[PDB]
């Protein structure tokens with residue numbers, strides 16, 4: 001009678017950890033959500049085949065409004081698993097589900113799996129230099145979110161990199177590209193004119209991390225805003241002042257302009 | 266003609282992803298390093314048996330001085346795997362290794378695995394609120410490094426959490442405890458007098474992340490500094506001002522005192 005929060009990783013169904021797979025295969029009931037992130041290298045079928053169980057997919061409303069009604073009840077008489085893309089507790093509101101489990105009298109365990117928060121390291125940027133993170137959300141109605149712009153500003157001032165998650169509307173199959181993210185930023189730039197993100201700002205694009213051949217590209221906004229980075233999911237990074245070694249990698253591995261090798265210290 | 270950087274994960278031999286394991290199996294040669302960090306919950310023996318191949322361990326010098334002599338030569342006519350604890354390239358050094366592969370005309374691919382950078386999410390603290398990170402190193406001789414203290418100040422000043430890696434002497438298999446780290450910080454505070462770390466500061470200790478039974482504890486330094494958090498590895502976190510839901514998780518899941526629901530929110 002326990003509940004397992006198990007991560008499925010970034011791209012493939014094989015991005016789950018061995019530990020996560022052994023445990024999932026022995027659970028009586030398996031649940032999952034696929035709205036917090038996009039797994040572009042697999043299908044629900046392959047995952048089901050991998051763990052050999054039928055997976056009941058839950059929507060954002062099932063989770064946020066009825067997790068303790070749909071999942072926890074069974075978790076008292078059986079071993080239940082809740083699967084999510086990437087790492088199970090990286091979504092802000094997921095950790096709260098453990099509280100719901102407790103109050104319901106159900107013990108829970110967490111099995112980690114690859115997550116962009118860690119996988120960004122493939123960009124070559126020093127992990128310790130990453131500051132506060134943010135998400136670039138789609139504008140809707142008269143509502144135009146801009147908080148993410150200030151996050152970049154605050155970090156850059158301290159010479160820290162900014163990890164930017166791009167928005168996703170799973171039920172509408174809408175996944176923001178790095179290009180769409182850049183456009184929104186150029187706009188907020190005109191709006192706030194703080195000199196944070198312009199055609200000359202250097203950025204890094206990471207698309208489909210977790211796959212064997214992710215797209216890692218670095219360069220100035222003017223030259224990348226129009227570039228094709230392949231299928232989603234996309235993540236966008238606005239680096240702060242670079243260390244020479246970071247620049248070297250970005251140039252040799254992400255095809256960035258040779259000029260960034262000249263750090264203006 | 267290919268080199269695979271495969272992450273082994275957090276604690277034991279099952280923390281590697283299924284993808285990582287399968288690829289390691291189909292590789293002709295398998296190397297590994299355990300100088301950047303260790304896998305406290307397993308042994309080279311268990312790992313070797315899981316992969317079903319002999320694993321040649323390389324030292325820091327083997328890698329830093331002769332990686333292109335030991336590893337790359339074989340990767341030109343074979344599929345080679347280089348296993349590392351955690352997630353590859355999160356070590357500030359491994360990134361350049363990809364450049365070396367390129368210089369030697371060897372293509373490289375990265376297979377991710379959970380790292381503390383993402384795993385800290387199990388503390389219930391919002392991932393986006395983590396700022397700059399630091400490592401707490403031991404003072405020795407007439408050298409007393411204290412920059413990690415400064416990092417905390419700057420993060421908390423902006424309401425951000427500080428992830429703190431504790432010193433490790435991999436080859437001597439010695440780990441700094443959270444208790445030791447707390448003691449060092451108080452000593453530093455006693456010199457800097459910045460109000461950054463005191464008996465009343467709220468901290469979070471995460472021990473044996475990746476295990477099914479990790480130790481997650483939150484509370485004031487005065488009460489945690491002599492508490493036994495179990496066997497290493499230990500991770501210390503100094504949270505900034507908390508959102509109510511973060512506080513509730515620390516109380517419900519990490520046993521923090523109710524006092525935090527009014528003092529640190």
Ligand SMILES: Nc1ncnc2c1ncn2[C@@H]1O[C@H](CSCC[C@H](N)C(=O)O)[C@@H](O)[C@H]1O
Pocket residue numbers: 010011036037038085086087088090091114115116117165166167168206207208209210211233234235
């Ligand atoms: N392989 C990948 N490449 C680029 N972005 C990714 C990604 N996997 C997830 N993301 C980003 O993460 C966002 C969801 S935020 C939750 C993150 C998730 N648990 C993780 O570990 O990554 C997505 O909208 C997407 O922009």
